[PDB]
Amino acid sequence: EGRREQLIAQVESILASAADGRVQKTKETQSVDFKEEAGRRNGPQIEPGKPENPEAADKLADEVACMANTPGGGALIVGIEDKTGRIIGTELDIDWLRQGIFTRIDVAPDVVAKRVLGQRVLAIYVAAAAEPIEDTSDRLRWRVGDSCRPVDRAEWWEYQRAQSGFDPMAQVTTATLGDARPAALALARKWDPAFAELTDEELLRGIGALDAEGFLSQAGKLLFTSLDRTAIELSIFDVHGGQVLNRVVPEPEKSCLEQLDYLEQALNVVNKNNTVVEGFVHKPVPEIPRLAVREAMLNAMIHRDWNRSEPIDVRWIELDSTLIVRSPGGFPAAITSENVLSNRAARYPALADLYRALGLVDKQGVGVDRMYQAMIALGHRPPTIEEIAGPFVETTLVGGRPVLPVLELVSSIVPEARQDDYRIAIVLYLLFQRPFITIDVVARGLQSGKEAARNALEAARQTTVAGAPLIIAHDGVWLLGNACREILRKVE
Numbered sequence: 001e002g003r004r005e006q007l008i009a010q011v012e013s014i015l016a017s018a019a020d021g022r023v024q025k026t027k028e029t030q031s032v033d034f035k036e037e038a039g040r041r042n043g044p045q046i047e048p049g050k051p052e053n054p055e056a057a058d059k060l061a062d063e064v065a066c067m068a069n070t071p072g073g074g075a076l077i078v079g080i081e082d083k084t085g086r087i088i089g090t091e092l093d094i095d096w097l098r099q100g101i102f103t104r105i106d107v108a109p110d111v112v113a114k115r116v117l118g119q120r121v122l123a124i125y126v127a128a129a130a131e132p133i134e135d136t137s138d139r140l141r142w143r144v145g146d147s148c149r150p151v152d153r154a155e156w157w158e159y160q161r162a163q164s165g166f167d168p169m170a171q172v173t174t175a176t177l178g179d180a181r182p183a184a185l186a187l188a189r190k191w192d193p194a195f196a197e198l199t200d201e202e203l204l205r206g207i208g209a210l211d212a213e214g215f216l217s218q219a220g221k222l223l224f225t226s227l228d229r230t231a232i233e234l235s236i237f238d239v240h241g242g243q244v245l246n247r248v249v250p251e252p253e254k255s256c257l258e259q260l261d262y263l264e265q266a267l268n269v270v271n272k273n274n275t276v277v278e279g280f281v282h283k284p285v286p287e288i289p290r291l292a293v294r295e296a297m298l299n300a301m302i303h304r305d306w307n308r309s310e311p312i313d314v315r316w317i318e319l320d321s322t323l324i325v326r327s328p329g330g331f332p333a334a335i336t337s338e339n340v341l342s343n344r345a346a347r348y349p350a351l352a353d354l355y356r357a358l359g360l361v362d363k364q365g366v367g368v369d370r371m372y373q374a375m376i377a378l379g380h381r382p383p384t385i386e387e388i389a390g391p392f393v394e395t396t397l398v399g400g401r402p403v404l405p406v407l408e409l410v411s412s413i414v415p416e417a418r419q420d421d422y423r424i425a426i427v428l429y430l431l432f433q434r435p436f437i438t439i440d441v442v443a444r445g446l447q448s449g450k451e452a453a454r455n456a457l458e459a460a461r462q463t464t465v466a467g468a469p470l471i472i473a474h475d476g477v478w479l480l481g482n483a484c485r486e487i488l489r490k491v492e
């Protein structure tokens with residue numbers, strides 16, 4: 001965009017004033033954000049910078065969210081003391097920092113190195129977000145003066161609508177508070193105890209659905225107002241191959257929230273749920289992890305085409321314990337079947353944010369990732385999500401009885417907190433297939449850069465099962481430790 005050029009220019013300017021160990025601003029370049037790599041100040045003397053620094057990554061990621069959240073975005077110069085303008089510098093690795101910020105904030109800003117008085121500095125260019133970006137502490141604030149204060153979704157959106165890109169699902173409609181069904185509102189309340197203390201009006205407005213004139217946005221209308229049509233429906237089969245045993249189609253006068261619930265409800269029943277025994281300790285386990293299902297559901301309900309008529313077609317196969325979710329629309333010109341687990345930009349950012357506001361979905365990648373994890377963790381195969389001729393996007397979850405050996409293999413992970421960890425899940429999975437694993441394979445697996453790969457591998461190298469690490473190094477590759485191999489030999 002033309003904004004970027006303006007921003008890069010401003011930075012060049014600030015840097016050109018370099019003299020006497022510090023830099024200065026001017027009315028034109030007053031908004032540039034001067035930041036100093038945190039965790040290096042000792043008072044009298046400042047420590048040398050390293051290529052990696054998680055503490056600094058945290059603070060910086062939080063700052064990027066301020067920026068991206070304020071309209072027009074802005075630029076940051078890491079390595080310049082705030083207010084004074086004294087050059088400090090930073091040796092943070094670009095790729096590391098980019099990937100690091102992206103992992104905790106959900107955005108990968110353009111960062112470029114620069115050299116002032118011989119010192120190195122990072123120029124970070126962050127663009128305006130199409131939806132609020134919550135920081136590491138789940139806060140939503142934007143740049144004001146040189147500092148940045150917090151803002152509610154209500155204000156954030158009216159401003160986004162006004163001076164920002166076009167979010168179709170955020171546009172104003174003719175729907176008013178009187179169009180919101182009490183049933184839908186009731187649902188929102190039983191799903192988030194926070195709203196409990198406020199009225200229907202201040203609720204819808206709190207989540208950014210309700211205008212200031214009293215109008216609902218397109219995402220607000222779609223969620224709390226009947227869309228006089230089926231949004232999603234279920235068809236229970238006996239076996240992948242036809243012969244419909246039964247179908248549950250929600251009434252068109254229901255809002256998406258109502259329709260979503262109606263499907264979830266009936267789905268909870270179809271998901272039979274059988275009993276597994278471990279050391280005579282018997283526990284009820286559904287054919288497919290509840291989370292995995294609801295995750296797949298909300299996912300379609302949020303990234304659906306919504307402009308198409310045909311409802312999200314969700315079918316359940318009895319004898320195979322598998323659930324298929326076909327959604328109208330296809331991967332946007334950019335995303336591919338092998339570039340989804342990394343994608344973060346939703347079709348309808350406005351709609352996505354509204355679901356977040358209601359507390360019905362996680363940041364984003366967390367969703368699909370927790371889904372994958374939940375599958376792998378029970379020894380099932382990862383949920384496959386490919387594009388079907390239509391356009392259509394179907395997600396397939398194949399479940400059934402859990403595989404005991406795998407359960408215990410995971411049950412024996414240490415630290416305990418690493419059991420439900422997505423990284424060790426992917427890593428262990430790649431090794432369930434391949435004999436050896438390389439940093440490249442781990443990468444293509446997580447569908448992420450080489451940084452995430454190194455990270456996952458490391459965490460797995462430090463994980464322990466039966467007093468031995470998960471993976472072990474040999475030659476120039478990595479491979480499952482005999483500890484696990486012995487547990488997995490008892491499969492089939």
Ligand SMILES: [Cl-]
Pocket residue numbers: 267268269271290293294
């Ligand atoms: Cl369920």
Ligand SMILES: [Cl-]
Pocket residue numbers: 167168169170347348349350351
């Ligand atoms: Cl949108």
Ligand SMILES: [Cl-]
Pocket residue numbers: 157170207208209217219220350351353354
């Ligand atoms: Cl919204």
Ligand SMILES: [Co+2]
Pocket residue numbers: 033034035082083146
């Ligand atoms: Co600053």
